[PDB]
Symmetry: C2
C-alpha cells in the first residue's frame, strides 16, 4: 500500500507527467494526514485520478490507478457506509471538501445519530446553486490590504467608470473596504454581492455596483450565469468561497436539528385554537394599546409581529410610534429581518453608542425604507436594534422546484432565533418579521418550524388602529413538498 507505487514509478518507461507525479504527492499526504483531513485528501486523490484517466484514456498507468481508486473508495465506505457511497462519491469527484464534510456526518449517522441528515445534505449539495462547482479568482492576491477580500474582479474597460463611482463613494464614506490596482485594472472588494445590493440606496454605490455587474456579464456571456454567479464562479476569493460553502451547510445542518428538536406539540398546547393561554379572547377583551402588550408579554420572552411584504408596514410603524408604550412592559430590544447582521449590526452598535450614523448604515436604511427616526428614538430611549438576518439566508433558485423557499425560511429563522435567545437575561424583545416565517413552512426533511415555535411565542399581527391579533399557525404547511416524496433516500441500518 505505502511501499507499492514508489519503486514502480522510478522505472522510467516514460518521463513522469506533472499531474501524475502530483498523484504520488497527494498519496503521501493521505498516509501522513490524520482525522477528517485524511478523508478530505482521500476524495481529492480520487479527483486527481479521474482527471488523469479522463485526460489520458489509454495509458499504462490507468490499470494501477483504477486499483488505487478502488482501494481508496473501498477503504472509506465500509459496511453501513456503503449506502451513501454513490451520493457522496458523485459530489467528491468535483467538490472533495464538501463531500468530506458530508462523509463525517455519515459516520455519525451510521451510529444511530441524526437520521436522514446525510440524504438531505447529499440532495442539497447538487440542488443548491451556491454549492455548485466553482474556482473563482486563483492568483497572487495582495496581503497588505486592511480588510479581508471577497472578490478580485478584473473590470477591463469598465475600470474607468467604476473608478469614478468608487472614488465618489469612498469620498462620502461608502464602500470603504475596496482598493484598486490600475496595473491589472482589478478591484479588491470586501463586500458580498448581497451587501452591495443593500447599499444600493446611495446613487454612488448603485452606479459602482452597476459597472461591477456589467464587467462580470461581459467577461462570461457564453454561460447562462447571472451577474451574481459570474462573480462567485470566476472572480471570488478562495477564502470567501471556502467559508460560503461552510455557511450554507451550517444552515442546512442547522435547519435539520431545528426541525427535529423543536417541541411543536407544546406550542399547539399553548397557542392553538384550543390553547391553554386562551390568548385569542384575552387581548380582544382587554381594550387599549398598553393593556394588550401586558397580556402579550407576561411570562413571555417577548413578542413577534407579522409583516405582509405586499404593503403592510404596521410592524415597523407600531415599534417606532408606540416605543414608549413598549418600554413600559420592559422591552429593550427591537428585531428586524430588513437588515443583515453581517455588516449592519456593528454599524448599529456603534451608532447607538456614539450617536454618529455611519454612511453605510444610512445607505442601508434608505434601501430597506427604514426611517431614521426609528434609530433616533431607539437611541434616545436607550434601546437595542438587532438584525435578525444574515447573508447566509440568501434564497437560492432550485430549478423546476419550490425548494428555494424552504432554505430562505429555515436559514433566516436560525439566524433570527440565534440572536433572540442569546440576549441578556431580563431584556425582552419586539421583533418584526415576515408572516411566512412566523407560521410553519414546508421542508425537505420534516418541516421548517416557524420562528414562533422556536421561541415559544405566538404569531401576532397589528392593525392600523394598534390592535393585536393572534394569527393561528397554518397546520397544512407541516409537510414535505410533493416533489420530495419517497424517492431513493440514503438510510443506514443502525
Amino acid at each position: 500500500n505505502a511501499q507499492e507505487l514508489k519503486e514502480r514509478a522510478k522505472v522510467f518507461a516514460k518521463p513522469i507527467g506533472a499531474s501524475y507525479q502530483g498523484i504520488l504527492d497527494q498519496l503521501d499526504l493521505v498516509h501522513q494526514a490524520k482525522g477528517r483531513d485524511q478523508i478530505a485528501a482521500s476524495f481529492e486523490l480520487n479527483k486527481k485520478i479521474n482527471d488523469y484517466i479522463a485526460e489520458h484514456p489509454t495509458s499504462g498507468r490507468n490499470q494501477a490507478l483504477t486499483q488505487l481508486k478502488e482501494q481508496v473508495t473501498s477503504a472509506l465506505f465500509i459496511g453501513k457506509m456503503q449506502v451513501a457511497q454513490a451520493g457522496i462519491d458523485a459530489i467528491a469527484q468535483t467538490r472533495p471538501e464538501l463531500a468530506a464534510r458530508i462523509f463525517m456526518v455519515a459516520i455519525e449517522e451510521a451510529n444511530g445519530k441524526h437520521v436522514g441528515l446525510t440524504d438531505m445534505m447529499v440532495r442539497w449539495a447538487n440542488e443548491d446553486p451556491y454549492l455548485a462547482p466553482k474556482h473563482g479568482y486563483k492568483g497572487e492576491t495582495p496581503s497588505d490590504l486592511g480588510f479581508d477580500a471577497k472578490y478580485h474582479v478584473d473590470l477591463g474597460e469598465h475600470y474607468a467608470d467604476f473608478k469614478q463611482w468608487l472614488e465618489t463613494s469612498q469620498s462620502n464614506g461608502l464602500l470603504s473596504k475596496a482598493t484598486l490596482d490600475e496595473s491589472t485594472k482589478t478591484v479588491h472588494l470586501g463586500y458580498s454581492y448581497q451587501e452591495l445590493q443593500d447599499l444600493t440606496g446611495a446613487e454612488s454605490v448603485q452606479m459602482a455596483f452597476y459597472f461591477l455587474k456589467e464587467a462580470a456579464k461581459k467577461a462570461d456571456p457564453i454561460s447562462g450565469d447571472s451577474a451574481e454567479m459570474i462573480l462567485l464562479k470566476k472572480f471570488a476569493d478562495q477564502s470567501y468561497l471556502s467559508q460560503l460553502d461552510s455557511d450554507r451547510m451550517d444552515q442546512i445542518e442547522g435547519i435539520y436539528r431545528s426541525s427535529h428538536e423543536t417541541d411543536i406539540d407544546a406550542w399547539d398546547r399553548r397557542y392553538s385554537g384550543t390553547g391553554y393561554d386562551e390568548l385569542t379572547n384575552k387581548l380582544a377583551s382587554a381594550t387599549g394599546v398598553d393593556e394588550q402588550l401586558a397580556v402579550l408579554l407576561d411570562d413571555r420572552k417577548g413578542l413577534l409581529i407579522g409583516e405582509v411584504h405586499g404593503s403592510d408596514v404596521n410592524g415597523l410603524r407600531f415599534v417606532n410610534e408606540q416605543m414608549d408604550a413598549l418600554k413600559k412592559q420592559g422591552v429593550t430590544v427591537i428585531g428586524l429581518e430588513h437588515l443583515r447582521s453581517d455588516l449592519a449590526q456593528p454599524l448599529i452598535d456603534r451608532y447607538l453608542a456614539t450617536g454618529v450614523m455611519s454612511s453605510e448604515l444610512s445607505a442601508m436604511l434608505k434601501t430597506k425604507h427604514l426611517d431614521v427616526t426609528l434609530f433616533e428614538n431607539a437611541r434616545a430611549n436607550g434601546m437595542r436594534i438587532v438584525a435578525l438576518d444574515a447573508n447566509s439566508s440568501a434564497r437560492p433558485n432550485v430549478q423546476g422546484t419550490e425548494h428555494g423557499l424552504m432554505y430562505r425560511a429555515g436559514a433566516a429563522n436560525n439566524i433570527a432565533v440565534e440572536v433572540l435567545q442569546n440576549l441578556p437575561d431580563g431584556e425582552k424583545f419586539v421583533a418584526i418579521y415576515g408572516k411566512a416565517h412566523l407560521q410553519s413552512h414546508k421542508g425537505i426533511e420534516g418541516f421548517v418550524p416557524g420562528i414562533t415555535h422556536r421561541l415559544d411565542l405566538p404569531a401576532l399581527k397589528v392593525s392600523d388602529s394598534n390592535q393585536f391579533t393572534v394569527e393561528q399557525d397554518d397546520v397544512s404547511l407541516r409537510v414535505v413538498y410533493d416533489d420530495v416524496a419517497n424517492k431513493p433516500k440514503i438510510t443506514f441500518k443502525g
Copy 2:
C-alpha cells in the same frame, strides 16, 4: 549696475547663498505681474540673510547697492510712505508683503484710504499671519486629495493608527493616508475641520494623539497645539491658501465697514421705523401673521442666539417649517456648520438621501438636531452654512482685536452666501446675537449682518413671537487701543 553682478563674482567659487541671489535676480526679470513683486521681496530677503550670516565679505557692498535699487524700484514717490511697514513684513515673509503692496499701489492713487495701514498692522498683529515654514520635504502626488498636514508621530503612531482605522471603518477621516516607513500621516483635513468632527469618538481620539505628537515635537516653544501644526507640519499649499484667505477677510471687512449704507438702515429699522414695525408684531399675534409682515418686500429674516442655553432659533425653524414655506422661504441659514467641508456633504444628503458619516458627526458635534435635516429634505428645502475656517478667531495679546476679526470675517461668509441665492427665494438664518448688531472695529466699525442685508435683528421666544432687538449704538466705534497711532496715509 543691476546686471553687473552676473559676471562680477564669476570672473573664489560662488557659494550656494550668493548663487541663490543670482538665480532669484534672474527670476525677477523673467517673472511678471504680482509674481515679480513677490520675487523682488524674496530677493531682498536672500540679500538680508546673506549679509546677516556673512557680514565680513566683499560681496556685501555689491549686495547693499542691489538692495537699495530693488527697494527704491518698488517704493517710488507717494508709495514711499508704506515702505517702512511693508519692508518689515517683506524680510520675514515676502508673499504676504507682496499682497499688501498691490493693495497699497492703488491706495496711492486714491482708492480705499487706510486699508494699507489696516493690512500692514494686521499682518504682524494676527498670530496666524506669522512666519511659518511648515513641512519641507517630499510631498506624495498620488494621495488623491490636497494634503493640509504632514505630521510625524514619533511614539504616537501606534495609538493614532488605531483610531484612524476605526474612523475610516465608519466612513470618517477618509482623506488621510499613512506612511509606516516615515511614521508620518498625510492628513487631508484642517485643524478646525477635525475640531468640528470631535462629536465622533473615533475622530476625537485620533485628533488628541495628533496634538500630542506636535506638542512633543516642539515642547520648548510656548505655542498651542494648533500653531505647531502650521509652523512645522502644514503643507506649503495649505499655508499659502490660509494666509491668502485671512487677508481676503481683512480686505473684505474694510469694504463692509466703508460701503454699507448704515444711515438708510438705521432710519427705517430703529428710529421711526422701529416704532412702526413693533406695532405689526404686537397687533398681529398669529404665527403666519408675524412672518407675513417680517417678509413684506424683504430678502428674509434673521434670528439671534446665545450659545449659553438659548436654542429657540434652531428649534423654531425645525418645528414651523411649513409655515415659513408659505411666505416664500427655501434656504435655511446656519452659523453652527462651516461651508469648507459641510456644504458639499449637505448638498449630497439633500439630493441622494444618504447622510455622510462626516456630516452626521458634525451635526452631533455642534449639537444640531438631525430631524431638522430630515424635514428639510422632505419639504424640498435647502440648508447652507454661514461660516468657514477663514473666520478663525485669533488670539491677539493685550487687546480685543481678535473679537473684531470673527465678528467681521464670519459676516462676510454669511452675507456673501445669503445674497447669492435664486431670484425670489427668501431665507431664514439663525446666528449669534453679536453678529446681528454692530460691533467695534479697527479701521471703522464692523457692521452686522442686518445692516448689509437690510434686515432687522429678530429673536423668537418660547411662545413663538418675534421681538426686534435694538442695535447697540455704543459699539459703532473704533477701539481706544488702535485710535490715535502711527497711521500710514498717502498723498492726494
